[PDB]
Ligand SMILES: N=C(N)NS(=O)(=O)c1ccc(N/C=C2\C(=O)Nc3ccccc32)cc1
């Protein structure tokens with residue numbers, strides 16, 4: 712750690728405080744996160760998982776029984792950019808570019824059987840060039856927490872969840888970029904589940920075979936009817952609504968993969984605009 716000078720406290724991440732810091736040996740500006748043998752091996756595997764849409768894990772420092780993770784630094788997260796674009800809205804070509812780039816990042820990680828498990832605007836980082844990158848990828852398997860982007864199978868007690876959990880989270884983020892409001896802002900596990908059910912309908916054996924046998928499923932859940940996506944994400948066009956609907960399928964097996972989402976007609980006219988960033 713003496714090779715790093717703290718510059719700015721970014722904030723309280725999921726596993727520890729993230730700082731902007733300077734490497735005294737290279738002059739490199741990095742993000743430093745201050746966090747068992749199982750964790751060291753899993754974290755070290757993430758150092759190999761390199762993609763332009765994944766925030767690079769530069770180094771793992773284990774000293775005095777403490778763990779420091781050194782990452783590539785980006786200047787802004789999607790939460791700040793969404794708050795800054797609240798009055799105007801993020802232009803649809805930029806939302807589309809960001810969704811496409813994040814689907815590329817997920818297709819890569821998922822092809823290597825690596826899940827994020829905790830996608831949210833706070834871990835999506837952006838730069839002046841128009842890139843967007845997934846931060847803290849794979850740390851959840853390695854080691855108030857927001858529930859807004861949690862997949863229904865996690866909420867219902869699935870212990871062996873799939874890559875589909877990240878597609879759900881990304882679908883929630885996509886809807887939030889479009890509407891300028893969180894899709895399912897639950898403030899408890901049951902409030903989160905019930906907000907999902909009130910929009911998408913209470914799941915049953917017809918739409919999700921095996922749902923009634925899940926650990927936290929209760930036959931006493933209220934039965935709400937599904938709403939149209941035209942009501943959920945206006946004024947998003949039918950290509951965007953159709954893609955979103957597939958990213959929000961209840962059955963994780965029916966839910967679109969990142970690879971298949973990249974081929975969706977919504978991306979026929981994808982471009983890479985440059986955002987209006989004040990740093
Ligand atoms: N400074 C605050 N609080 N918000 S901000 O939008 O300006 C902002 C600025 C920088 C960052 N950077 C965060 C990080 C970063 O650069 N690399 C990381 C790797 C893992 C986790 C977090 C990061 C995140 C947010």
Ligand code: NA
Nearest residue numbers: 760761767768
């Ligand atoms: Na990396």
